[PDB]
Tab-separated table of C-alpha atoms and ligand atoms in Angstrom:
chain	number	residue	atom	x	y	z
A	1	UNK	CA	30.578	-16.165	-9.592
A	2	UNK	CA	32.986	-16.363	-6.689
A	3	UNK	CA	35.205	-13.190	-6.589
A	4	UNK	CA	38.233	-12.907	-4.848
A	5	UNK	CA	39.077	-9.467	-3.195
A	6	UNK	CA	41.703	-9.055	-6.058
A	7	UNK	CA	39.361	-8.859	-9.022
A	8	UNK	CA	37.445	-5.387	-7.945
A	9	UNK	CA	38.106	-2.628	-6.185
A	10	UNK	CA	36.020	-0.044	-4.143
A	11	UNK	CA	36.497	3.813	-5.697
A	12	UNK	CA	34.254	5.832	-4.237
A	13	UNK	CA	31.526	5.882	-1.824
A	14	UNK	CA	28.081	5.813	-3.058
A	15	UNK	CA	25.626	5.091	-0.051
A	16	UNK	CA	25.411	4.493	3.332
A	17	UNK	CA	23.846	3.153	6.256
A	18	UNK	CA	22.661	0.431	8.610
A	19	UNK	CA	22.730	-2.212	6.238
A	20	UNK	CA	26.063	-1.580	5.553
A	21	UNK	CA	27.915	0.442	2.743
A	22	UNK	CA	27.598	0.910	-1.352
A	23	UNK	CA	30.974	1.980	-2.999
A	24	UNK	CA	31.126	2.599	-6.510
A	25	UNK	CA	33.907	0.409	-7.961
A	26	UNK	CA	35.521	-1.037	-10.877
A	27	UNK	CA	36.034	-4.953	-11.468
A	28	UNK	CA	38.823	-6.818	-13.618
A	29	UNK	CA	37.687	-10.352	-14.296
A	30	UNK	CA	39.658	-13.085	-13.477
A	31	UNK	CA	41.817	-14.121	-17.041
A	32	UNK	CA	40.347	-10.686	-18.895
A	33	UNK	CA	41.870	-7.563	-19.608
A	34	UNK	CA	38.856	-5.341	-18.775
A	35	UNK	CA	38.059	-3.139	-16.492
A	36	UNK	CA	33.918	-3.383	-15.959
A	37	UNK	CA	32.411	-0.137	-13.906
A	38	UNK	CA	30.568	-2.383	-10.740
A	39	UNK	CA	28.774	-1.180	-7.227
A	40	UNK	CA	30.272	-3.110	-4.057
A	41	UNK	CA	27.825	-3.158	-1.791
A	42	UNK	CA	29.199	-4.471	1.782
A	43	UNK	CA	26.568	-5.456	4.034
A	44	UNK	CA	27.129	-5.061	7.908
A	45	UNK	CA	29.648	-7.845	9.773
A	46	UNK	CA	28.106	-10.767	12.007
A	47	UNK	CA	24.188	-10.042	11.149
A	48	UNK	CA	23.929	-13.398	9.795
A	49	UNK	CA	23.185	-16.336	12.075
A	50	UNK	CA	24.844	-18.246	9.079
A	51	UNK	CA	28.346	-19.676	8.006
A	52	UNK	CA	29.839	-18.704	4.831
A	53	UNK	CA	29.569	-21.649	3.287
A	54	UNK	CA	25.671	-21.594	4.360
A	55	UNK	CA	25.267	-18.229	2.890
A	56	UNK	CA	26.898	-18.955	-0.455
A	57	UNK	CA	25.158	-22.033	-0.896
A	58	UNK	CA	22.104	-20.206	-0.634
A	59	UNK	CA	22.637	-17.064	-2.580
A	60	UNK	CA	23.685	-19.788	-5.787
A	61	UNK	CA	20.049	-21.100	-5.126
A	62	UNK	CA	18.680	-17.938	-5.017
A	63	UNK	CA	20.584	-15.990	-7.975
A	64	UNK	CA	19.503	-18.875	-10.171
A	65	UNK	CA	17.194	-15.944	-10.784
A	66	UNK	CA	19.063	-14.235	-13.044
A	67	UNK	CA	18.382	-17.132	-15.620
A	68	UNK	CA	16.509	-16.111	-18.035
A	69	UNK	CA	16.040	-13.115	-16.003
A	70	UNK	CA	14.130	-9.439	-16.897
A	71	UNK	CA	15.384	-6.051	-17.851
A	72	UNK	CA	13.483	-4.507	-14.442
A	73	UNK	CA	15.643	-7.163	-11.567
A	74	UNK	CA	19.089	-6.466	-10.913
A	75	UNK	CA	21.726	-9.319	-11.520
A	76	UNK	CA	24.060	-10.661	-9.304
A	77	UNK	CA	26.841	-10.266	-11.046
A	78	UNK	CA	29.410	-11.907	-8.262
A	79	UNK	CA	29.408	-12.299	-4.298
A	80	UNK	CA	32.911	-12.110	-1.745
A	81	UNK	CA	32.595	-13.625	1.016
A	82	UNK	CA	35.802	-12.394	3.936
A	83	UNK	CA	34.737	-10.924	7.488
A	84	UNK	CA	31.865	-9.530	5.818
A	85	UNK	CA	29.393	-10.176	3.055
A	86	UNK	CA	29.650	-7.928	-0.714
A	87	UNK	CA	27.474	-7.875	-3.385
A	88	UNK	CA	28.510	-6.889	-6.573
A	89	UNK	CA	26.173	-5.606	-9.139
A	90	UNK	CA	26.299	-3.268	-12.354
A	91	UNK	CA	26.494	0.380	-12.111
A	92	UNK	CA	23.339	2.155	-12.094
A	93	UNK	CA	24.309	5.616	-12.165
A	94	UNK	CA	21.728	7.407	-11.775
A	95	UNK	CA	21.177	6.119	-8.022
A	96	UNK	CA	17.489	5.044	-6.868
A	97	UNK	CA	14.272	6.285	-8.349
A	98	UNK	CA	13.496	7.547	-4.233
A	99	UNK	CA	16.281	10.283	-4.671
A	100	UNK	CA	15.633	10.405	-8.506
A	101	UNK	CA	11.855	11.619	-7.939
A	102	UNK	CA	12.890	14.002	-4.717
A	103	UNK	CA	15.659	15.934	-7.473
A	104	UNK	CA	13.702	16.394	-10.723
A	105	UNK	CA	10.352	17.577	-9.292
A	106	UNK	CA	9.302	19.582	-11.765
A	107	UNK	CA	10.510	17.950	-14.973
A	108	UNK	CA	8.937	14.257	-14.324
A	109	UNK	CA	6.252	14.114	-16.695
A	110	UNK	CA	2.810	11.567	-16.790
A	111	UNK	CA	5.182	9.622	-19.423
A	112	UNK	CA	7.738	8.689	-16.867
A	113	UNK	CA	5.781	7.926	-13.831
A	114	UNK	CA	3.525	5.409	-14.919
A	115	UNK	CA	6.236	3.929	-17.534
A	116	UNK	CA	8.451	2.784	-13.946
A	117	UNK	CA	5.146	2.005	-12.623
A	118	UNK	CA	5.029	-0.571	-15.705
A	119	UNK	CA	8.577	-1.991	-15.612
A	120	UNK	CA	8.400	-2.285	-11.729
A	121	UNK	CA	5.422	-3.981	-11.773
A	122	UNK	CA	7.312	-6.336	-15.497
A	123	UNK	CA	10.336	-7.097	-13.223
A	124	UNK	CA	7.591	-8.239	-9.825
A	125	UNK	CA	5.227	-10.185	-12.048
A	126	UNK	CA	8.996	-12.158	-13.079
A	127	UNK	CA	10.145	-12.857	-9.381
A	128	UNK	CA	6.565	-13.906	-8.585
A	129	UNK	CA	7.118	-16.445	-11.877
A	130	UNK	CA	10.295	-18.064	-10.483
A	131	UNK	CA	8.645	-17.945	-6.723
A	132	UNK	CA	10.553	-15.657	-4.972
A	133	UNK	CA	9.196	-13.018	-2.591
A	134	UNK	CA	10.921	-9.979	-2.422
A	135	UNK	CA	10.187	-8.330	1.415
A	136	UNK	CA	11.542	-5.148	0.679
A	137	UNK	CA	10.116	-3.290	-2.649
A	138	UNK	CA	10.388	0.252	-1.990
A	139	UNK	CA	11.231	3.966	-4.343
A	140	UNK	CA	14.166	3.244	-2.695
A	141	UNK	CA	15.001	-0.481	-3.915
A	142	UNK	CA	14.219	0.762	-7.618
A	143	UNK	CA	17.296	1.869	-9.128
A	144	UNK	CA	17.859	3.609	-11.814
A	145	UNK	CA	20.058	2.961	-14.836
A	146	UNK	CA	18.656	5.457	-17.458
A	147	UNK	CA	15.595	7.890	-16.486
A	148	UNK	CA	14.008	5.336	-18.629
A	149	UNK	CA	15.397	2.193	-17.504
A	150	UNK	CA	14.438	1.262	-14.075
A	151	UNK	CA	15.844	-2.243	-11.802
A	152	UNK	CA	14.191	-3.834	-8.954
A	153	UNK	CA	17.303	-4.658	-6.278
A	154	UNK	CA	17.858	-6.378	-2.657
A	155	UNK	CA	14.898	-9.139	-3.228
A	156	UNK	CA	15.210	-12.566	-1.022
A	157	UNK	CA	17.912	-10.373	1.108
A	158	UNK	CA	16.335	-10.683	4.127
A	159	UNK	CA	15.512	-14.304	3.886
A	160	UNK	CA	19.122	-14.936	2.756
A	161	UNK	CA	20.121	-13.301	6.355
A	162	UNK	CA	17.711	-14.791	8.601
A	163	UNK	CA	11.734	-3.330	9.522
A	164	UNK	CA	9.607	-1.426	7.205
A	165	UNK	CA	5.726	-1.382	8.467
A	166	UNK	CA	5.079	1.285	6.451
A	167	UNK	CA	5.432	-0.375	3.246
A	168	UNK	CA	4.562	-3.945	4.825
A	169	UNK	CA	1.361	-5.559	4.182
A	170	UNK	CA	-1.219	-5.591	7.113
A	171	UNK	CA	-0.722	-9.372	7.499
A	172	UNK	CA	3.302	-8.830	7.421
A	173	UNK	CA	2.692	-6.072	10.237
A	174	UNK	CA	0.683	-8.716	12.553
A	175	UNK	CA	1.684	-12.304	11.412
A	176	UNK	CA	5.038	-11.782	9.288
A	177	UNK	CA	3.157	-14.009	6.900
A	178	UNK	CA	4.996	-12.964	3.381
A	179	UNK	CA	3.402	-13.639	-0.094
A	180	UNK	CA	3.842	-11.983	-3.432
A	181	UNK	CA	-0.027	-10.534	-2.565
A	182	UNK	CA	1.740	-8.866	0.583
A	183	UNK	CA	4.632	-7.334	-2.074
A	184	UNK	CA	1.644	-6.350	-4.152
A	185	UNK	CA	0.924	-3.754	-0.914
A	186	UNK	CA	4.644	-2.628	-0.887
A	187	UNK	CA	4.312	-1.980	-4.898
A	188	UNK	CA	1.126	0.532	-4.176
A	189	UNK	CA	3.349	2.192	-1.264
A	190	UNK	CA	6.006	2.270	-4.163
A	191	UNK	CA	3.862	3.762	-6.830
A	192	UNK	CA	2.469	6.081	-4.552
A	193	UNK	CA	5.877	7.870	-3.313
A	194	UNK	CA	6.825	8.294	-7.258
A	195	UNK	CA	3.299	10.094	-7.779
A	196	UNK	CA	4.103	12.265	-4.518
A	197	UNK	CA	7.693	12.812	-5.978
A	198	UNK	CA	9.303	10.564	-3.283
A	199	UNK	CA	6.706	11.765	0.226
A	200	UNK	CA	7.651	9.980	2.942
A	201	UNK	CA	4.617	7.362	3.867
A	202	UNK	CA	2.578	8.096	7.403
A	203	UNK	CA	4.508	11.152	8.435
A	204	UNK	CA	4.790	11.431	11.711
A	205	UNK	CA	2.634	8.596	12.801
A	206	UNK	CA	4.765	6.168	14.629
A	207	UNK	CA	5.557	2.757	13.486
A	208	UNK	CA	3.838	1.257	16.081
A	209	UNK	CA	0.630	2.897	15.294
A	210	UNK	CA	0.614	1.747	11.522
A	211	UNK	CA	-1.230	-1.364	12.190
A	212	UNK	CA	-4.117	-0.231	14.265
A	213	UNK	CA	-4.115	3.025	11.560
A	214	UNK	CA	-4.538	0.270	8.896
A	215	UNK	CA	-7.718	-1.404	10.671
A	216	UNK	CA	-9.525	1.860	11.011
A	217	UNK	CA	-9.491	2.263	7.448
A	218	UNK	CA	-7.504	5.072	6.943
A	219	UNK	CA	-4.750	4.644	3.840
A	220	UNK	CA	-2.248	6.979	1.968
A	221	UNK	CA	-3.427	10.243	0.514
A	222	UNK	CA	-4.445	10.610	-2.527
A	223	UNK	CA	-1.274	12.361	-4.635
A	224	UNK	CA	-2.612	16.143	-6.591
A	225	UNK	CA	-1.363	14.380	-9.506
A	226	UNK	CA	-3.690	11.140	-9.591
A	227	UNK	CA	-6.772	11.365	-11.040
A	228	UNK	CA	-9.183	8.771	-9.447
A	229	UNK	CA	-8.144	5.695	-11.818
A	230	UNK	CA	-4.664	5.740	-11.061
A	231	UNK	CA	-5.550	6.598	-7.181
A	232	UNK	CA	-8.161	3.218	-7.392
A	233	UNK	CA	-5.111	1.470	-8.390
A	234	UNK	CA	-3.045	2.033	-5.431
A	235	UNK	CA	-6.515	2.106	-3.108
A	236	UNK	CA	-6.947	-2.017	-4.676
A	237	UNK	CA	-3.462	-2.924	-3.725
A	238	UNK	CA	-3.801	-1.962	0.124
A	239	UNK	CA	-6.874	-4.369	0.705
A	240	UNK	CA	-7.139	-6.189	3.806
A	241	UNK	CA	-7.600	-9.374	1.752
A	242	UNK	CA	-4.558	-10.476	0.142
A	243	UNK	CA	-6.185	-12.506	-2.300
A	244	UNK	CA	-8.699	-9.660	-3.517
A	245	UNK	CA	-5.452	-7.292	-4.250
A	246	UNK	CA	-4.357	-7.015	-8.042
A	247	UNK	CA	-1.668	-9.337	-9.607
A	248	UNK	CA	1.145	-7.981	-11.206
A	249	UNK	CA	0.177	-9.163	-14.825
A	250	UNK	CA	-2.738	-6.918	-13.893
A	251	UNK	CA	-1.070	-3.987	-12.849
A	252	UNK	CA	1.698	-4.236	-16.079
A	253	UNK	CA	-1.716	-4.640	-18.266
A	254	UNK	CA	-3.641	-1.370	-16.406
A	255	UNK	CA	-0.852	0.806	-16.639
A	256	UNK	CA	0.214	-0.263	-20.070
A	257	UNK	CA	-3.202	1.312	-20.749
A	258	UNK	CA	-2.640	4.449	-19.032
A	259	UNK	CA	1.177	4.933	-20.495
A	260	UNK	CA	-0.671	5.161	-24.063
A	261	UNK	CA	-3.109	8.541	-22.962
A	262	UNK	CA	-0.668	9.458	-19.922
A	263	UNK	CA	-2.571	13.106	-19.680
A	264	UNK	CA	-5.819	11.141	-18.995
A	265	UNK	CA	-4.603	9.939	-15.466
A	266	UNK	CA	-2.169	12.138	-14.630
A	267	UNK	CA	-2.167	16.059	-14.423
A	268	UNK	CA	1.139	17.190	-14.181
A	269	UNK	CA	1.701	21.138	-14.597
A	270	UNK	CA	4.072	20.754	-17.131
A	271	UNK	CA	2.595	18.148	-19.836
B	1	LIG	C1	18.801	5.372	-3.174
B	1	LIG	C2	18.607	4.670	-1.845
B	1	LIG	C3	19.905	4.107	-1.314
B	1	LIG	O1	20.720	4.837	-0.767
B	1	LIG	N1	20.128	2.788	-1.475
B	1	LIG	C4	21.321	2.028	-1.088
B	1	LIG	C5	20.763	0.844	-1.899
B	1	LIG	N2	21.581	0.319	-2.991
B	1	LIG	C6	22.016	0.984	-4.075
B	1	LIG	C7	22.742	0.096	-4.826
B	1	LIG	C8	23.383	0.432	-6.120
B	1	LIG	C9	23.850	1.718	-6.372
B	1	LIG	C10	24.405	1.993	-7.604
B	1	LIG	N3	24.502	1.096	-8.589
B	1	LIG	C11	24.006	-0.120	-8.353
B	1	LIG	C12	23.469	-0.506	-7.144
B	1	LIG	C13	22.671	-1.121	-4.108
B	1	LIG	C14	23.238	-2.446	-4.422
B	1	LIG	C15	24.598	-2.618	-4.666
B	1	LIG	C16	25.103	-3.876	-4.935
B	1	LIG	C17	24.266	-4.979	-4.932
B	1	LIG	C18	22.907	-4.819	-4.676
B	1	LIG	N4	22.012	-5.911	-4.644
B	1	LIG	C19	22.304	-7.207	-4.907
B	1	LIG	O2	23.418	-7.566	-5.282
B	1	LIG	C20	21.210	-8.191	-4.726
B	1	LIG	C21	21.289	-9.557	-4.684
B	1	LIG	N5	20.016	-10.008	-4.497
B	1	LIG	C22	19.602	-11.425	-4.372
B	1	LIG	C23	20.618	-12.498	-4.581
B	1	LIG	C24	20.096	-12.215	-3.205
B	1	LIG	C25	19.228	-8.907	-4.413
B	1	LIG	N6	19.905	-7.786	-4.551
B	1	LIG	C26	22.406	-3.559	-4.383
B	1	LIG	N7	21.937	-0.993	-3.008
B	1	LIG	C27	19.622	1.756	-2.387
């Protein structure tokens, strides 16, 4: 869907930052009489290398992913090209499972956690189905629709605009070599800041130090809520061999498992 700058408009302001702005918005579509609650999100001016017509050509190729598509990836519901680049998706309103996890500490119980840990994992095993690499999964690239409802957004971004290390892959980090086993790392950086209640990863150590960090051995913590299987879990999906780390049919199937006794893997003062 083309849109022209007519058919929505940008209420409030949701986010913002580098990348450029999300407003919360409303959209009419063109020849219907509704009003459909959207979020606008306007990336930064001239950070593409590429025309308009480039970039549109490509994002058509690339939201070809929303056919048949999963419950856990955002759609694309319609792009507007001008100076500057917007992205127009359904409203999530409950912002991203990063902020989600930081606000209701104490009332997320085992039931929760590894349920998003599922779907995140339901809506990665689909992108790695119709071959495309995210480069970006992060607590903060989950959003979240319903506490029990959870989307993966911004995949193939960065490759549709030709730097996180410390969710990258150790082979991202020194070769930039990109994979769905190097998003596999990324998805045990993800599950690990929802079992810390949104942590920040490496605190303190600088960027620049991740890599050498990583070579030595040394990984995330293990989170006071993880009991050793769940912990494992995470441990498998920062190997040094790409190959080696889980799939995400595996991961959906192992935590499946562990949704169905959650107080067996997870101790949570409050269950
Ligand atoms: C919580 C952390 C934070 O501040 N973030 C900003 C970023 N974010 C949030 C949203 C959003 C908020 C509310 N409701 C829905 C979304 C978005 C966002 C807005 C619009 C569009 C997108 N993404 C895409 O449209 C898109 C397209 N692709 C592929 C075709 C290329 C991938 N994603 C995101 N961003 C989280």
């Amino acid at each position: 869907r083309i849109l022209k700058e007519t058919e929505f408009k940008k209420i409030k302001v949701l986010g913002s930052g580098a990348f450029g702005t999300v407003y919360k918005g409303l959209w009419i579509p063109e020849g219907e009489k509704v009003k459909i609650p959207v979020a606008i999100k306007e990336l930064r001016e001239a950070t593409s290398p590429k025309a308009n017509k480039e970039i549109l050509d490509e994002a058509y190729v690339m939201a070809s992913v929303d056919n048949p598509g999963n419950p856990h990836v955002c759609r694309l519901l319609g792009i507007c090209l001008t100076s500057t680049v917007q992205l127009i998706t359904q409203l999530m309103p409950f912002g991203c499972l990063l902020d989600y996890v930081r606000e209701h500490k104490d009332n997320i119980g085992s039931q929760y956690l590894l349920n998003w840990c599922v779907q995140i994992a339901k809506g990665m095993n689909y992108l790695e189905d119709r071959r495309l690499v995210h480069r970006d999964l992060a607590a903060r690239n989950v959003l979240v629709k319903t506490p029990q409802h959870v989307k993966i957004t911004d995949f193939g971004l960065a490759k549709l605009l030709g730097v996180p290390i410390k969710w990258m892959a150790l082979e991202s980090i020194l070769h930039r070599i990109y994979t769905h086993q190097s998003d596999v790392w990324s998805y045990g950086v993800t599950v690990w800041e929802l079992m810390t209640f949104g942590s920040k990863p490496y605190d303190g150590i600088p960027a620049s130090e991740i890599s050498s960090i990583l070579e030595k051995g040394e990984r995330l913590p293990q989170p006071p809520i993880c009991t050793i299987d769940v912990y494992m879990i995470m441990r498998k999906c920062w190997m040094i061999d790409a190959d080696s780390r889980p799939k995400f049919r595996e991961l959906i199937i192992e935590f499946s498992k562990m949704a169905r006794d959650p107080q067996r893997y997870l101790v949570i003062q409050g269950d």
